[PDB]
């Protein structure tokens, strides 16, 4: 009965519109929310530091009236002086949730298995699914409804975000294009699972190696940093490309960028960025994710 | 007031530990109920080697309690380094309502109580783990009520910090202890006389014995500990041909009162100082006895805040 | 328009004496001002660990009801992985205030310029604007009026705080001395900006290095260690040239004679300062460091509240 969110598909459709409606009430009212009330405690776990996604975890769960523990690497990492098990049913004795950012899936599913309250996965090697709660939050509030728009992710389509904004986007109903050089596609699972949730939400997947038509007609251009970088040269989000978008198009990027190789100066900093909204809302997005977590568990 | 601490478990008499756990099953009834540390007020919690398990207990506790938590661990310089020890503890007086701290020697603790204006407590040590038994009594007694006049047998290496605490906390509660120990690991003679000392206070006693068979019989409550600690993992010793006749297994469990409990402060080491029958077993406390940490101390904190 | 605070004088000499004024009221009722109620986070970042730093300010900020987020220096040092004014615009997103350990002053001043909200030198090469607040703070309850008094510093002159106690004196009207050896002068921008300070306030600023001189008729005398960290391995003798500037017992009895011992913490006793100096009645050193959570909390419910 206990739910996890270790991948952006652990979400149906419905209930990933309701955790992005809860991030745009809890945006509003930050501090509406206390669920962790006393305070409660959230466990924030690393097994490599991520200063930006513990920053966002930490202040988000205070703000839920909890307190968050962290646990950097340098300290033991989990799992090497007692057996997960042990260590996830200790924790659901002292934390109401536990987020934790770790390498491979294997991990993730092995303490949603066993532990007694919800696990988030913060960042994984496979997955980045607050993020893209929060870059579609972003859309929401750049664009309204997310159901029929067309986003274009451009890069290596390999790595975490580009298999989270095909899950999670063609969970909200956006056709999703990855454009990605040979030997840098989205792993096979990822893009059949992709296909299915997109049959239900009217939504497509495209994979392909032509940046020009990927961005044409795009109303959401993404990318990420690259990291060996003559593979994506023709991939970098310029404002050549972005000349090819919808009227009103968007971009997104996870921070930090590498200004110059994967984005332009004058992309980052030009009207059509949404970078700095879509980093603050992953202190929102990941609030909802976890109000609505604990409610159901 | 005299200012209270906290360094080992017969600090407290056996009516003050008995304060203590009462207030520790009432803090775990109602954990936001008893806030002395509103403010927030600060505690700092001082690490000379890191203790994710201890932080965890210690940071939320004192976060129900009201107050702010204030960790310094071991990558900071370690204190009485590029400072004294007695300057450290004048300046944390002016800022913590108490102070905790996760050392080695004792010595170090004690000079530490000596000179601060606040409660010291002894988060973990080489020599005790108080902190870990107060958690451990809380449990036995939710398990088994009174206390007193329950028989307690801890196996395995007899001059570790738990051992040495199991004996002074334990008597201090009523409970006959045994240590069940291969020669060469037995308690220290200072505390093996302090416990003696206790028990007649409180008429219980201390036994020590190489006879894991005749530590279990009868026993109400069977405890273990991992073998080797960090520091001893170079001292030269096989650590294991020693201790293998005195492992917690489905053997020695059965051996004692057919209610018997089994604890053992976490983590463990599955297939050494217990097995995983036991640990998994009805018989296992562990759980309980881990969440108890967070309980305990802040019982702990409060009766001492309230008595400085 | 938005304030920082990354060097003493960039208070006025009356802005200066309302965080004082606040340092004194917060001293008195600790969790009273609550302007980060919420919580409201707030960035403590450090480029260098400061343990000291970090404590006070982690506690004060929890006090004024907000979350301190710290950073430590195992995270990528900001402007490696990321431009310092990208840093600067997200901060600005998700705290309410910027607390910064960092190196030379060119940071802090790029910073500043992008953030939109307000950013406080925790400590720096340069300068160390908050340990002189609360030394000020210090001073303050012990003697009374901070106008007109005689401080002088002993020890490197060219340190953080050197530079801030020049400045930061100035501001108060206090007249400030430091006395070092050749070759660790204050830095002469600094002094230069303590002199024209020193016009506005009836304040004045001298440079000796006649220790004994310095010492006659001080108010409030002032050392710090004569090495950070950073300069061990500069390849100078950093022990003899500083011998005859040791904070003692005979340096203190040429004092006024109710004067007063600061010394930043930690101390190297036996080195700058001496046992009997620290542990005798003109030692204010305790409070001045108990000072650092107060001030600091003033300082920035003062920067939060103008801007
Ligand atoms: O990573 C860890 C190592 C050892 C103990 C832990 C306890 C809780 C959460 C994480 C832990
Ligand atoms: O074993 C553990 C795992 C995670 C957290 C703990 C807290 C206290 C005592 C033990 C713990
Ligand atoms: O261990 C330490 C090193 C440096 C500073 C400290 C301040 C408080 C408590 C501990 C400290
Ligand atoms: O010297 C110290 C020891 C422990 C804590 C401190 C906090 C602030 C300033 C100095 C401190
Ligand atoms: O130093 C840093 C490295 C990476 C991320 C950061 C976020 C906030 C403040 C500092 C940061
Ligand atoms: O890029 C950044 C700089 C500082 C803080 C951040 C927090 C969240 C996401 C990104 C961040």
Not at 261 to 277: C, K, L, N, Y
Request: aromatic share 6%; with cysteine.
């Amino acid at each position: 009965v206990i739910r996890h969110f270790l991948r952006d598909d652990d979400l149906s459709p419905a209930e990933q519109a309701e955790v992005l409606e809860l991030a745009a009430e809890l945006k509003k009212d930050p501090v509406s929310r206390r669920p962790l009330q006393g305070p409660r405690g959230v466990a924030v776990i690393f097994d490599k530091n991520s200063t930006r996604t513990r920053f966002s975890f930490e202040l988000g769960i205070a703000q839920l009236g909890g307190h968050a523990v962290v646990v950097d690497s340098g300290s033991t990492q989990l799992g090497r002086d007692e057996t997960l098990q042990d260590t996830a049913k200790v924790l659901s004795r002292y934390v109401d949730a536990i987020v934790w950012r770790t390498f491979g899936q294997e991990r993730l599913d092995a303490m949603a298995s066993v532990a007694t309250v919800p696990v988030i996965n913060a960042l994984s090697d496979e997955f980045h699914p607050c993020q893209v709660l929060a870059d579609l939050q972003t859309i929401a509030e750049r664009k309204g409804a997310l159901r029929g728009l067309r986003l274009s992710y451009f890069g290596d389509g390999a790595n975490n975000m580009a298999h989270s904004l095909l899950l999670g986007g063609v969970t909200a109903g956006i056709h999703v294009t990855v454009a990605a050089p040979e030997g840098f596609l989205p792993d096979p699972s990822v893009r059949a699972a992709a296909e299915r949730r997109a049959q239900d939400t009217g939504a497509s997947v495209t994979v392909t190696a032509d940046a020009h038509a990927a961005a044409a007609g795009a109303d959401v251009l993404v990318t990420d940093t690259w990291t060996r970088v003559k593979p994506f040269r023709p991939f970098q989000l310029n404002s050549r490309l972005l000349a090819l978008a919808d009227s009103d198009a968007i971009v997104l990027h996870c921070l930090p960028a590498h200004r110059g190789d994967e984005i332009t100066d004058a992309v980052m900093d030009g009207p059509a960025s949404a970078v700095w909204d879509e980093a603050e809302n992953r202190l929102h997005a990941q609030k909802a994710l976890l109000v609505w977590l604990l409610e159901r568990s």
